[PDB]
Amino acid sequence: APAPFADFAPPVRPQSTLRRAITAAYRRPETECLPPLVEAATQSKEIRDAAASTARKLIEALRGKHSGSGVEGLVQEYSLSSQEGVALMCLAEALLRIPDTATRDALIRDKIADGNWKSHLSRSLFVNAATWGLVVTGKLTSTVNDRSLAAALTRLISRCGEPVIRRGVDMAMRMMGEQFVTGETIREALKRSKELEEKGFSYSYDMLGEAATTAADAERYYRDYESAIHAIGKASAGRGIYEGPGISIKLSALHPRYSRAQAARVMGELLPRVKALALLAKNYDIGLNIDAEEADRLELSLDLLEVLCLDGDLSGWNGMGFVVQAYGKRCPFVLDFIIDLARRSGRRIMVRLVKGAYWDAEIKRAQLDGLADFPVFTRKIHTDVSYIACAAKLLAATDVVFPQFATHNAQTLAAIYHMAGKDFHVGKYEFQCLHGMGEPLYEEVVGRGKLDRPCRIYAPVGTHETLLAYLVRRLLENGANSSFVHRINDPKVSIDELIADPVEVVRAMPVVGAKHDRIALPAELFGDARTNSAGLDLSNEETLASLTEALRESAAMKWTALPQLATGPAAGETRTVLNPGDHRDVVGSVTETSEEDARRAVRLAADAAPDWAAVPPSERAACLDRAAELMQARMPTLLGLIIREAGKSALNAIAEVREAIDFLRYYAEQTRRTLGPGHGPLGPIVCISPWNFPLAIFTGQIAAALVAGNPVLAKPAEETPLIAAEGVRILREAGIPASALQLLPGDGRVGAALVAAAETAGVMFTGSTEVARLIQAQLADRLSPAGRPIPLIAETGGQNAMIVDSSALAEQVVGDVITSAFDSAGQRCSALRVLCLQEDVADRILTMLKGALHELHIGRTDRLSVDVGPVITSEAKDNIEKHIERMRGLGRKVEQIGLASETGVGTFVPPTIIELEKLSDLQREVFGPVLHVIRYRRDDLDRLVDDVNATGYGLTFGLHTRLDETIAHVTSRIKAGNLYINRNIIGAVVGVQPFGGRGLSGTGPKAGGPLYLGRLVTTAPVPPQHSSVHTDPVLLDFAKWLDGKGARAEAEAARNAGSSSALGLDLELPGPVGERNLYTLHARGRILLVPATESGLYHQLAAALATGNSVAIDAASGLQASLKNLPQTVGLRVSWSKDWAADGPFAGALVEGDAERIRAVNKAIAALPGPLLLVQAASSGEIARNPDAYCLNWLVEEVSASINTAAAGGNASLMAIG
């Protein structure tokens, strides 16, 4: 039996002093980074003045020859609006997908110019309109208003005809064939390079590959690089690495799992591929540059650079190159490492200094991961100082490295030109620029008549498809508000402003190196409301080394879970708790609760209830906040327990502990916002939690119940009692009295005994729908001492779909699908179960998905390299496998990963893809790593949404599309609680995506949302921000009808309900950059009304209508004559039901009657098939006395929507942050 965590995340190599200095700087506070950069970048006043003069001269040259762009001239000639310009370029792009020229021109003349372009051109014309929007307007719009573009295209064609189409086609052909790329193929690019080479430029060809998703992708990128090296080397013809052309590669193109977590595969599989390419570059004596990518790949890439530079087979060749990003805090330390490596190896490493291309993505990633700080600067001027400081370091080392200063900023250029001094020879250093962007500047640099310094042009090479994939990121490099190229084209920016010295500006700031005011550190995402939980950086070697030791220590602990009654630990049946990934690994011991002790615990909770209710809400919230601090400090140990007890990966364990911390802090803050003396607790609450979020959901339910003033009986899932016991220990340490929080480990029998206990005043259940239904039936037997139903929150299963159309980027889709379906072995309630692919793209995406499936590592989760862990039990495994084999037996195509022999000691199911004919082929939630794939024709999208809704579930839902019309359609028609656009569908964040569904997926209110605490008190408070200015119009029609009938009191109550209803609430919740998180209140659906009196019926109708619902009224009430002559608008919402089971599904119920009538109705309601109904009951006297007899909080449905606004390739809002 392998020792737990003995091989968790060993580094590729022992970290040298120089490597450790890099890691130490990863997230160093910005105020600490700047002072040494300012000092290193300082130059003499004489040099600064000469640099400013050179920069001014270059800028004056740039602005003097600056003409109007081709697109601008086209927009001017045809008087195009911006949308028309964008639509025209999209049309031109589509026409260029027609390969034959004569065919294309015939389509233009005979069909496009004089008729409906729509009839002639499965794929929206406007798929890339966000890119063309950047080209035309300079502004990024993340999604495409395809209806506006279609209108604009019709308008411009009908107005201007063939001539404008011809001009647009010719413009797009030039831009996509000669500007965004040097050429479509390496041979074409090489042919077009001779002109500038003759002037003194050189070239580095960028083959535009990146982010391989499959082994086949990586092999394709490999053979593309290999073929390009041959062409470049043949053309170089012995010119060598400085005069002659070279190639640039991205490591992410060469392996589908290029990450620190997969470092062993990277060194074993990616490295030999780079070596083979480098050997070919050596033979031709050309440069081979490794481009720099995301910050979490920097240090990993250094391990490849080290091995290659020490490999004797590459000796004699100085063409190996490596990019370093000056926007990164580690940059100077990386340079120190590289310079030393160049000294040790004797290789004159070609070092390309760039600022960095991934800035907005780095901000978003650090915020999402809750990390200490950013790995990049947050003020643009800091990057500029960093660049100059790093140039100073490089210029001191030209004997051992070849510095390559890649920049389009004439101020940066001038500073370095003068820093380098008078002595120059080709080979000492060079500048670099981007093809079709930097030539105007560098035509003022290259040549004896200019500055006589060489410039290497980074030359993209590729087809239209290849160049468009990440063109947005490239356009933002030089097109943001802080970008030099954007500013040089802004007439409101003076030359004096452009030549401003960033070194001196930073030096004079009040606080040198202060963070940008408008970028929140991850801890501060929520501002004054609460402190964000902190994560851990699994790319940081210090973090991995520290976590390795903490994880090993956690595995040595004698974890136990006992029945912790108010009186102390109780005796019971004790058994071991085994690691699901290896049953030989005993994690701890659980003593389970007898049914007698469960009943005793409820009585003890009932006796203790007044004492806990008397703790003021602020103090109860303080306990939650203290518990959050304790869990944050204990996170490494908690991770180890979650990994081993629940079979979770470290990444998912981190998120689990963060969620528990977030629940504690969120419910604490919500309490401080709401709870007062009049919001009395229900009493003892039974909290029954599932195994799959054994700390987070466990903590969330208990924390909410406790902070609302209720004592808690906590019944964790039988599979995962140990982490639950630790959570209870932490809450008790934080100040929750033992009498207020009792842990009762055991199976469903303990849960059922707790539910059935007479003093149980409320039940919070998260688990399967089938078990919730049994709990619902048991609670229907009971009424509170006041004679009202026992509140049940039942958050249950999902049958979660993702719809993908032909506008989505397949690589993005596949990543989000692989994560959503197979993370946690599909054992998230939110997991993607059904992927729906538009027919035209289905085969391509399916091929990519299967390829990505086979790159997953399944095994025991005490290794960072494991992507998918075990399923929780052999019974779960058998249940999942029975489903897979049923599908296989029906002839459905089944793709499965092969499992390693090591999985035999645990319970594993390989990630599986099953292709279905229809969504209806899938009949039940299969809680495992099983993705079902269906295909749909675009015209059947609305029917498909019906099919998704038809399962009865409504938990999470994803949509991948760029098209606003599709977003609007799908999101308006789907009925699910958590919607996700252009991102994965998992990992809902407390207070950001309040989580919970409808139908068979939940009663609500949503956990992690603002209605939750109000369910746990007898009188719900008004949640923060909970109101709406909208009044339901059918409610208004009903109020007028009531007035016409003379029911004046009820009409007033109806108007009050119309105002008090929060239907129509529509909020954006604070969260990370690059995402829009929305929270809205909608009608629940059809509410079952069970009235007893005419006035009761009118009050019930008012409540239901005010919240946007339709109703089914019990025909057995005999009250049909009370609704004579209803307005048609109200009648449309009213049905009468004799057979309630036939007229569902309902989305809630309102009941009027005495206690025994309520009990009877509650039993009849519990017997209805399908979803658990949130039932509210009141007596006739209560309706007369209490305007809030029926609470409107429970008659609306919460919907959370999370939109990835960075999905097009950049963040429009951050383009304004410099």
Ligand X SMILES: O=C(O)[C@H]1CCCNC1
Q: Binding to ligand X (CB under 6 A): which residues in 653-712? A: 659, 693, 696-697
Give the residue with the Cβ less far from ligand FAD, 375 or 826.
375
Asked whether residue 691 is marked as a ligand-binding residue, the answer is yes
Residue 474 binds its own copies (CB under 8 A): no
Instruction: Enter the tokens of residue 1173.
Output: 């109904």
Asked whether residue 715 is marked as a ligand-binding residue, the answer is yes
d(CA 583, CA 906): 6
Task: Report angle CA 332, 336, 338 to the nearest 5 degrees.
Answer: 110
Among 207, 208, 323, 361, binds ligand FAD (CB under 6 A): 323
Q: Binding to its own copies (CB under 8 A): which residues in 945-964? A: 964
Among 19, 329, 408, 860, binds ligand FAD (CB under 6 A): 408
Q: How many chain residues interact with its own copies (CB under 8 A)? A: 79
Residue 697 binds ligand NAD (CB under 6 A): yes
Residue 454 binds ligand NAD (CB under 6 A): no
Asked whether residue 768 is marked as a ligand-binding residue, the answer is yes
Task: Yes or no: say if 301 and 291 are a contact pair by the CB < 8 Å rule.
Answer: no
Task: Yes or no: say if 579 and 587 are a contact pair by the CB < 8 Å rule.
Answer: yes
Q: Quick count: other Cβ atoms within 10 Å of Cβ 112?
A: 24
Residue 251 binds ligand FAD (CB under 6 A): no
Asked whether residue 925 is marked as a ligand-binding residue, the answer is yes
CA-CA distances (angstroms) from residue 570 to 329, 717, 759?
54, 18, 20
Q: Which residue of the set 362, 719, 726, 795 is catalytic?
A: 795
Residue 690 binds ligand NAD (CB under 6 A): yes
Task: Yes or no: say if 539 and 260 are a contact pair by the CB < 8 Å rule.
Answer: yes
Q: Binding to its own copies (CB under 8 A): which residues in 651-670? A: 662-663, 666-667, 670
Asked whether residue 659 is marked as a ligand-binding residue, the answer is no
Task: Yes or no: say if 286 and 241 are a contact pair by the CB < 8 Å rule.
Answer: yes
Taking residues 462 to 481 in sequence order and writing x for each that binds ligand FAD by CB under 6 A, - otherwise, the string is ---------------xx---
Task: Yes or no: say if 476 and 1210 are a contact pair by the CB < 8 Å rule.
Answer: yes
Q: Report how far apart the first and last C-alpha atoms of the chain are (Å, whole number).
A: 54
589: left (phi over 0), alpha (psi -120 to 50) or beta: beta
Residue 289 binds ligand NAD (CB under 6 A): no
d(CA 929, CA 936): 23
Q: Which stretch binds ligand X (CB under 6 A): 22-30, 268-276, 741-749, 980-988?
A: 980-988
**Known catalytic membership, residue 829:** yes
Residue 1217 binds ligand FAD (CB under 6 A): yes
Among 285, 659, 718, 823, binds ligand NAD (CB under 6 A): 718
d(CA 504, CA 1114): 79
d(CA 72, CA 136): 7
Task: Yes or no: say if 457 and 203 are a contact pair by the CB < 8 Å rule.
Answer: yes
d(CA 1033, CA 1028): 14
Residue 795 binds ligand NAD (CB under 6 A): yes
Give the residue with the Cβ less far from ligand NAD, 245 or 767.
767
Taking residues 1042 to 1061 in sequence order and writing x for each that binds its own copies by CB under 8 A, - otherwise, the string is -x-------xx--xx--xx-
Q: Quick count: other Cβ atoms within 10 Å of Cβ 236?
A: 23
Give the residue with the Cβ less far from ligand X, 5 or 822.
822
CA-CA distances (angstroms) from residue 716 to 719, 726, 876?
8, 11, 18
Asked whether residue 1136 is marked as a ligand-binding residue, the answer is no
d(CA 626, CA 528): 17
| Selection from 970, 938, 956 nearest residue 833 by Cα | 956
1020 binds, among ligand FAD, its own copies, ligand NAD, none (CB under 5 to 8 A by kind): its own copies
Q: Quick count: other Cβ atoms within 10 Å of Cβ 1155?
A: 14
Residue 37 binds ligand FAD (CB under 6 A): no
Among 689, 720, 827, 830, binds ligand X (CB under 6 A): 830
Q: What is the DSSP letter of 1062?
A: -
Residue 699 binds ligand FAD (CB under 6 A): no
816 binds, among ligand NAD, ligand X, its own copies, none (CB under 5 to 8 A by kind): none
Q: Quick count: other Cβ atoms within 10 Å of Cβ 16?
A: 13
Place of tokens 């004596």: 285
Residue 985 binds ligand NAD (CB under 6 A): no
Residue 693 binds ligand NAD (CB under 6 A): yes
Residue 433 binds ligand FAD (CB under 6 A): yes
Asked whether residue 1211 is marked as a ligand-binding residue, the answer is no
> Which residues lie below 8 Å from residue 1204, measured CB to CB, with a gap of 6+?
980, 981, 982, 983, 1074, 1075
> Which residues lie below 8 Å from residue 427, measured CB to CB, with a gap of 6+?
242, 402
d(CA 820, CA 837): 15
Residue 825 binds ligand X (CB under 6 A): no
In the complex, the smallest distance separating the C-beta of residue 1217 from ligand FAD, rounded to whole angstroms, is 5
d(CA 618, CA 1049): 39
Task: Yes or no: say if 641 and 677 are a contact pair by the CB < 8 Å rule.
Answer: no
What residue type is 119 in one-letter code?
S
Give the residue with the Cβ less far from ligand NAD, 694 or 1058.
694
Q: Which residue of the set 33, 331, 433, 829 is catalytic?
A: 829
Taking residues 750 to 779 in sequence order and writing x for each that binds ligand NAD by CB under 6 A, - otherwise, the string is -xx--x----------xxx--x--xx----
Q: Binding to ligand FAD (CB under 6 A): which residues in 711-730? A: none
Residue 919 binds ligand FAD (CB under 6 A): no
Residue 1129 binds its own copies (CB under 8 A): no
Beta strands in 291-344 (DSSP E): 320-325
In the complex, the smallest distance separating the C-beta of residue 441 from ligand X, rounded to whole angstroms, is 48
Instruction: Enter the tokens of residue 1014.
Output: 């109000």
CA-CA distances (angstroms) from residue 373 to 524, 703, 989?
11, 29, 20
In the complex, the smallest distance separating the C-beta of residue 1029 from its own copies, rounded to whole angstroms, is 4
Beta strands in 301-435 (DSSP E): 320-325, 349-354, 401-406, 430-434
Give the residue with the Cβ less far from ligand NAD, 290 or 990.
990
Place of tokens 């793209």: 841
Phi, psi of 814 (to 5 degrees): -65, -40
Q: Binding to its own copies (CB under 8 A): which residues in 68-107? A: 79, 81
Q: Is 118 helix (H, G, I), strand (E, B) or coil?
A: coil
What residue type is 801 in one-letter code?
A
1031 binds, among its own copies, ligand X, ligand NAD, none (CB under 5 to 8 A by kind): its own copies
Asked whether residue 352 is marked as a ligand-binding residue, the answer is yes
Residue 483 binds ligand FAD (CB under 6 A): yes
Among 207, 445, 829, 934, binds ligand X (CB under 6 A): 829
Phi, psi of 744 (to 5 degrees): -125, 85
Give the residue with the Cβ less far from its own copies, 146 or 299.
146
> Which residues lie below 8 Å from residue 297, measured CB to CB, with a gap of 6+?
251, 252, 258, 259, 260
- Annotated binding residues for Mg(2+), written as ranges, equal 1166, 1168
Residues that bind ligand X (CB under 6 A): 659, 693, 696-697, 828-830, 986-988, 995
Query: Binding site residues for FAD, as ranges?
Result: 292, 325, 352, 355-357, 359, 378, 380, 407-409, 474, 477, 482, 484, 1217
Tell me the catalytic residues. 795, 829
Binding residues: 292, 325, 352, 355-357, 359, 378, 380, 407-409, 474, 477, 482, 484, 689, 691-692, 715, 718, 767-768, 795-796, 925, 1166, 1168, 1217
Residue numbering of the annotated binding site for NADH: 689, 691-692, 715, 718, 767-768, 795, 925
- Contact residues toward ligand FAD (CB under 6 A) are 291-292, 323, 325, 327, 352, 354-359, 377-380, 382-383, 406-409, 412, 432-434, 438, 458, 477-478, 482-485, 516, 1217-1218
The residue ranges that bind ligand NAD (CB under 6 A) are 688-693, 697, 715, 717-718, 747-748, 751-752, 755, 766-768, 771, 774-775, 795-798, 829, 925, 927, 955, 995-996, 1001-1002
